[PDB]
């Protein structure tokens, strides 16, 4: 599941369409994207 995080109260969240960029719980207009399980590789250097 694609998700976001409320930037004021850290409540997880997802928005699809005809959906305002707001926190459902508080009304914060700033949302930050969460990171999900996805592979990245690094050399240990």
């Amino acid at each position: 599941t694609l998700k976001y995080i409320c930037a004021e109260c850290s409540s997880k969240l997802s928005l699809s369409r005809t959906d305002a960029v707001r926190c459902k719980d508080c009304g914060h207009r700033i949302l930050l994207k969460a990171r999900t399980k996805r592979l990245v590789q690094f050399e240990a250097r």
Binding site: A20, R22, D25, C26, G27
Partner: protein
């Protein structure tokens, strides 16, 4: 509208299939009443048809299917069951279809959502208007189980059950085809039947005279005046049962009739079950962050120590047990004061009979003169 007007009826019946344990024979018969009643709308012109369907119609076809099965349910219960909001009558438009609501027109859904209760014989007319559309005769039995209705009316006011046997004899004196009480279709007139030819409404007069024919001509002096005080003040007694409190709700919904303001005289415990009934009103009946925070400061239950888990042995007595108080209260067994307490009891029981059948005062004053002035017609 028709597909949604069906959809509420399924939830009314699957309730009555499950909770009130009206068995699975009911949907297989009530569909036939529902499948036929669309065909009378079929033979209208589809151009500007003006079909007549209302929430009064989904209860009427729920009652025609009940008076086919010879059931001891009556229209008293169908007008009690919706005031207590058990079966989805009021505001059934809201949560049930979930998509047919959004594209139905407003006057097409204000008829669909039940706002005002059926009043002044609105329920009886819709029975007769339905039976004029599809004929209830030669496929269903228009047979009121009047033995159950009188036994219901005996069990209402805790009387000596000889008046049950009297009233059965009394209807035999004045009735066409003695049993088999007439469910009355109408199709000739849009007027109401001023004879008041509703069979259950007829029995409402046969009980209002059988208790007065006996007691006014006190020949045997079997029921004394000192017992009448023990009877008349027995009914004027606020109690908390599972049926009196449901009857308190019906006095709320109708404001025209008197004793619509009886809630001033409720006790402490009488409001508490009313408020626990109100928790069975809320489930039938961006700016949400404000209201959520107000429900945070007013929790709907008690703020602490509610009466759910560790409460009692019993609070709520049932309808078997209040009669055991009542049939022990009226213990004396062995005239201008009598003629005053002959209308005191008769008015009191009438007020319960007005409120439990959704008719006016003027409806019953019509019905008495059309039963009394047909019984004198037998003697002279």
């Amino acid at each position: 509208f028709l597909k949604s007007f069906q959809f509420i009826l399924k939830r009314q019946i699957r309730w009555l299939i499950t909770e009130m344990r009206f068995p699975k024979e009911f949907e297989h018969v009530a569909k036939i009443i529902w499948l036929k009643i669309l065909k009378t709308i079929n033979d209208q012109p589809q151009e500007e048809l003006k079909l007549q369907l209302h929430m009064t119609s989904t209860i009427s076809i729920l009652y025609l299917a009940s008076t086919h099965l010879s059931l001891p349910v009556y229209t008293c219960d169908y007008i009690k069951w919706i005031c207590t909001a058990k079966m989805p009558y009021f505001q059934a438009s809201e949560i049930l279809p979930k998509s047919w609501r959004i594209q139905l027109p407003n006057y097409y859904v204000s008829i669909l959502e039940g706002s005002i209760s059926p009043f002044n014989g609105q329920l009886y007319n819709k029975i007769a208007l339905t039976c004029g559309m599809i004929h209830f005769k030669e496929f269903f039995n228009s047979e009121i189980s009047c033995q159950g209705l009188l036994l219901k009316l005996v069990m209402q006011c805790a009387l000596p059950p000889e008046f049950y046997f009297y009233t059965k004899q009394v209807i035999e004196f004045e009735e066409t085809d003695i049993r088999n009480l007439t469910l009355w279709e109408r199709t000739d007139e849009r007027h109401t039947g001023r004879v008041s030819n509703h069979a259950e409404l007829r029995v409402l007069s046969y009980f209002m005279l059988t208790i007065n024919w006996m007691l006014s001509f006190d020949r045997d002096r079997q029921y004394p005046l000192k017992w009448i005080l023990s009877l008349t003040e027995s009914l004027t007694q606020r109690t908390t049962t599972s049926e009196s409190i449901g009857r308190n709700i019906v006095k709320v919904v109708y404001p025209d009739k008197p004793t619509s303001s009886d809630y001033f005289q409720w006790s402490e415990e009488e409001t508490l079950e009313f408020l626990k009934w109100m928790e069975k009103q809320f489930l039938p009946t961006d700016q949400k962050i404000a209201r959520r925070k107000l429900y945070k400061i007013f929790p709907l239950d008690r703020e602490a120590n509610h009466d759910g888990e560790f409460n009692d042995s019993t609070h709520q007595l049932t309808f078997i047990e209040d009669l055991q108080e009542r049939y022990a209260k009226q213990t004396p067994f062995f005239p201008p004061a009598r003629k005053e307490a002959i209308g005191r009891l008769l008015t009191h029981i009438a007020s319960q009979l007005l409120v439990d059948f959704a008719i006016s005062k003027e409806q019953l004053k019509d019905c008495i003169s059309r039963i009394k002035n047909a019984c004198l017609h037998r003697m002279n």
